[PDB]
Amino acid sequence: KDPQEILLNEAFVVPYGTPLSVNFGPTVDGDFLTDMPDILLELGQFKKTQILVGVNKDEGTAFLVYGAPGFSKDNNSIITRKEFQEGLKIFFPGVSEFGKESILFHYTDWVDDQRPENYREALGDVVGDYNFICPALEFTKKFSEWGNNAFFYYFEHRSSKLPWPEWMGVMHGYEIEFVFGLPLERRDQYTKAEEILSRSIVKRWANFAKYGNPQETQNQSTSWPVFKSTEQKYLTLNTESTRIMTKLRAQQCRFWTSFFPKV
Amino acid sequence: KDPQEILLNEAFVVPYGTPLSVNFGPTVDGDFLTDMPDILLELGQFKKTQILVGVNKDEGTAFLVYGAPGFSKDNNSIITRKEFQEGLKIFFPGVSEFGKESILFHYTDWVDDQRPENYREALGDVVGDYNFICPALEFTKKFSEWGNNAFFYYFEHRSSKLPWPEWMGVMHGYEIEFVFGLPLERRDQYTKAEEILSRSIVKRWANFAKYGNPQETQNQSTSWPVFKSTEQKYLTLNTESTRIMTKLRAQQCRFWTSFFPKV
Amino acid sequence: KDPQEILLNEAFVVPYGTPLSVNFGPTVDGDFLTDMPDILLELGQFKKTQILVGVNKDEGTAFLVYGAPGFSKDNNSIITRKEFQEGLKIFFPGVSEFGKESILFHYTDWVDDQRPENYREALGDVVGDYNFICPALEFTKKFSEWGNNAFFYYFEHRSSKLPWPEWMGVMHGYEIEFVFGLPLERRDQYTKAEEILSRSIVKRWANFAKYGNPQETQNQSTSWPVFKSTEQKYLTLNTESTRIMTKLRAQQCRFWTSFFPKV
Ligand SMILES: *[C@@H]1O[C@H](CO[C@H]2O[C@@H](C)[C@@H](O)[C@@H](O)[C@@H]2O)[C@@H](O[C@@H]2O[C@H](CO)[C@@H](O)[C@H](O)[C@H]2NC(C)=O)[C@H](O)[C@H]1NC(C)=O
Ligand SMILES: *[C@@H]1O[C@H](CO[C@H]2O[C@@H](C)[C@@H](O)[C@@H](O)[C@@H]2O)[C@@H](O[C@@H]2O[C@H](CO)[C@@H](O)[C@H](O)[C@H]2NC(C)=O)[C@H](O)[C@H]1NC(C)=O
Ligand SMILES: *[C@@H]1O[C@H](CO[C@H]2O[C@@H](C)[C@@H](O)[C@@H](O)[C@@H]2O)[C@@H](O[C@@H]2O[C@H](CO)[C@@H](O)[C@H](O)[C@H]2NC(C)=O)[C@H](O)[C@H]1NC(C)=O
Ligand SMILES: *[C@H]1O[C@H](CO[C@H]2O[C@@H](C)[C@@H](O)[C@@H](O)[C@@H]2O)[C@@H](O[C@@H]2O[C@H](CO)[C@@H](O)[C@H](O)[C@H]2NC(C)=O)[C@H](O)[C@H]1NC(C)=O
Ligand SMILES: *[C@H]1O[C@H](CO[C@H]2O[C@@H](C)[C@@H](O)[C@@H](O)[C@@H]2O)[C@@H](O[C@@H]2O[C@H](CO)[C@@H](O)[C@H](O)[C@H]2NC(C)=O)[C@H](O)[C@H]1NC(C)=O
Ligand SMILES: *[C@H]1O[C@H](CO[C@H]2O[C@@H](C)[C@@H](O)[C@@H](O)[C@@H]2O)[C@@H](O[C@@H]2O[C@H](CO)[C@@H](O)[C@H](O)[C@H]2NC(C)=O)[C@H](O)[C@H]1NC(C)=O
Ligand SMILES: *[C@@H]1O[C@H](CO)[C@@H](O)[C@H](O)[C@H]1NC(C)=O
Ligand SMILES: *[C@@H]1O[C@H](CO)[C@@H](O)[C@H](O)[C@H]1NC(C)=O
Ligand SMILES: *[C@@H]1O[C@H](CO)[C@@H](O)[C@H](O)[C@H]1NC(C)=O
Ligand SMILES: [Cl-]
Ligand SMILES: [Cl-]
Numbered sequence A, B, C: 001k002d003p004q005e006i007l008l009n010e011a012f013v014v015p016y017g018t019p020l021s022v023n024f025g026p027t028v029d030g031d032f033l034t035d036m037p038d039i040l041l042e043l044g045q046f047k048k049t050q051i052l053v054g055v056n057k058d059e060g061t062a063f064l065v066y067g068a069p070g071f072s073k074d075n076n077s078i079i080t081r082k083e084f085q086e087g088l089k090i091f092f093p094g095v096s097e098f099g100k101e102s103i104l105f106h107y108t109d110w111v112d113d114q115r116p117e118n119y120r121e122a123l124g125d126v127v128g129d130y131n132f133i134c135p136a137l138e139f140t141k142k143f144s145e146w147g148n149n150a151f152f153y154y155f156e157h158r159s160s161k162l163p164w165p166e167w168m169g170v171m172h173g174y175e176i177e178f179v180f181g182l183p184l185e186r187r188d189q190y191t192k193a194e195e196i197l198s199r200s201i202v203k204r205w206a207n208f209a210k211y212g213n214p215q216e217t218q219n220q221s222t223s224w225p226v227f228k229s230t231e232q233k234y235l236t237l238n239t240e241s242t243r244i245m246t247k248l249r250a251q252q253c254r255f256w257t258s259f260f261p262k263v
């Protein structure tokens, strides 16, 4: 077949997909991967070394404009409860009615005013917690229980140049340009606070690669503590002040990690 | 009013009740009880002393014949899924559809053959775990976290004289006659194994009252360990062999204690 | 000599044997085995690695029908005290009168009714505790005191196809077919509960071989804890529910391990 005929048919090998569908991805082949990876992780069968893991504050928002009803990058995407419900059918298509109601139960008990954006925000958090944040935190817990140093970050700076609208917040993919040092180029109209943030992240990442320890040692920086089971310390990355916090998304992750897999 | 007019109307002060309805019971009166008792328990505001707490293996079965459809003391009460569902509506009348589906989800994932009695047993366990066993275990955990010795038992002997049918098992109320020593009377046709069981329970209860420690010290008995948070050791009471076990109904109680109150 | 003449004479090289006689077995040869193996075990002179060890609930019953008087696979084998006594002479032929009375003393203090099967059961337990269970537990204790992980199981499921009679219980040899996965073959008329039990044992054994840890990680299974001196946790294997228990046959093994060797 010509490549194009293959590419044209890939979307359709599945009876329904979502904005996050991975139709052709890694499998347990008995070669690269010798067993189901959740078993290897759980029983400590992996390279023993240091890791640096993290996520962005609004991981799930980018995906909402690729099919959730009522959402648009060109307006504030205020949706109703009915829209939120239709939105869960878009992101959880093979999932039982009970499963989808369990999501709604967990994410719509509001604190508290009748804010118009309640349902818009809840959907972005559903999608980002399920697909990115709770699995990164569980991976880091399980990895670190076998004795190696791990360091977790929560990236919470929205780029001053971001071409997507404000309601999408600190989107998935938009820490990358800070990691590779693009705001170090003054000619590019990032802010001064972003130059300093990128410079500090670049130093932490290079120190982690060179020395296994993602510190910034020269500029009275917050010290980045290892992430352990029990305390679960992580470091927030932002232009204002870096903080050590604990137990990121604790109540949400208990839902996705210990209950939802049963559904 | 004459007493009879009061008694006749008590059943009806509530728009629907269940076999377990307590229409007139303890309240927070600012006198006997100075605050909501869950607050006092949680914050350690109670008499500091030893406690002995326990439950019977089939606490919920006695209640099923007072209104769950398909149940009868005069047949084996095999029910269907539909009956099980109607049964939850009888025992959880003010509870949302989602709440009742959550019960069914948690109790009907079977291990495993298509046993006819699956749903009959699941209903007795729902009712006994929610109303008796998980709350006794939570009370004992919370009490013991403030530093006092607590001892938990699981009573699992069905009286040889029990006039209710076999499917009801080790029913609610039927440890009482062992505690008060009725099987010590040989004229009454309990078995010899029941005489010995009652004699040992009577000694443990009297030792607990006299000395704060419910041991039977003279007859090479299993030593009854204190119940602590963390290990949650309890002692099984039966005619065959007494065992030390841990974490009674762990998976079920996590459901009733940490999830169900939200529903 | 022709092989047959050798085989014909093997039974007779010993002045009396028992159903468990090993007339030609391992010896201390100064080659395969460099010293008495109890010395090597006691002083830690063995390969340092993980072990998985376990026993079946009724190890000794299979042997009773190969010579104990009153026993038969074709009836319920209720025996008398005199039969029990003759039975000890069959299984402990070189042992002093005092030694045999010590066995009877330890196993016949009954709890408690005058059950007809008291002596039948006591004999199966004598033979299974002395020959299999207490030595497996002592081996596992002594091995694990030198620092390696060990996991102990107690197998308590009687195969639905077992052609021996009910009184023999969970016999010696009858876990093997669960380990090798024979109940996975639906065409063979094991029950559904046995298919699931075998599937779980097969996974635990393969995980132990591959990873040194006999967990079943995917199906909310009971976690199998290491067996340590002090706590002596073991895992029960059955079709109903898997339990973590402690100190298997504690009172019996103290008899066989610390007293009987003196006799
Ligand atoms: C924000 O936009 C969405 C997206 O749809 C629209 O894009 C707009 C910016 C505008 O150009 C509009 O014409 C275009 O259709 C609106 O949702 C849509 O609403 C329409 C019209 O009512 C529905 O019939 C559509 O099915 C629905 N589209 C999708 C993909 O759901 C949305 O209402 C609007 N929200 C606002 C203004 O708050
Ligand atoms: C076990 O009994 C129940 C209870 O109802 C019955 O009590 C029986 C022992 C017998 O005397 C019967 O006539 C009496 O009604 C049975 O459930 C009942 O089934 C009937 C007839 O089909 C229904 O129409 C009833 O509504 C229902 N009663 C209740 C309270 O649910 C039940 O089927 C039976 N179960 C068995 C035999 O397994
Ligand atoms: C259960 O059987 C044993 C075994 O002996 C017998 O096998 C039976 C099923 C039957 O065919 C019987 O004829 C055969 O001998 C019984 O013990 C035997 O009892 C006999 C007759 O009284 C004694 O004289 C034998 O020596 C004795 N055999 C052995 C090996 O001990 C046994 O009594 C019987 N038990 C029951 C029925 O409870
Ligand atoms: C994988 O197997 C079938 C494949 O069915 C598919 O045919 C393909 C060539 C492709 O075009 C694909 O879109 C189409 O779905 C799946 O069967 C589907 O199941 C649905 C019900 O959900 C039925 O309606 C059809 O048989 C078929 N779908 C449609 C839209 O026609 C099957 O679901 C799948 N296996 C999985 C998901 O595990
Ligand atoms: C307590 O207040 C009312 C009381 O309504 C009741 O009138 C009583 C005298 C008594 O007979 C009782 O059985 C009757 O219910 C409750 O109002 C009920 O709510 C339902 C809907 O669930 C309506 O149908 C009625 O107003 C009434 N019930 C019936 C069966 O007619 C109210 O529910 C209750 N408060 C609670 C439960 O907190
Ligand atoms: C090993 O040495 C002798 C061997 O005596 C045996 O002669 C063999 C060829 C064989 O047939 C065997 O069955 C026979 O016993 C043992 O001597 C026995 O001791 C008993 C008393 O218990 C005497 O009666 C005999 O000398 C002989 N037995 C019989 C039945 O005739 C000796 O016991 C043994 N050593 C051990 C057990 O350590
Ligand atoms: C540290 O501070 C200096 C000057 O005070 C600055 O120029 C540099 O960017 C900082 N370095 C890092 C690694 O953040
Ligand atoms: C202890 O055992 C004796 C005799 O061995 C018995 O009569 C008595 O009932 C037992 N006592 C208790 C307190 O269980
Ligand atoms: C786990 O459960 C699945 C389905 O719920 C079942 O088919 C499989 O046999 C189980 N696996 C193991 C290893 O026990
Ligand atoms: Cl709704
Ligand atoms: Cl904390």
Ligand SMILES: [Cl-]
Pocket (backbone or CB within 6 Å): none
């Ligand atoms: Cl249904």
Ligand SMILES: [Cl-]
Pocket (backbone or CB within 6 Å): B246, B247, C244
């Ligand atoms: Cl435990």
Ligand SMILES: [Cl-]
Pocket (backbone or CB within 6 Å): none
């Ligand atoms: Cl005697």
Ligand SMILES: [Cl-]
Pocket (backbone or CB within 6 Å): B244, C246, C247
């Ligand atoms: Cl113990």
Ligand SMILES: [K+]
Pocket (backbone or CB within 6 Å): A102, A259, B102, B259
């Ligand atoms: K739930």
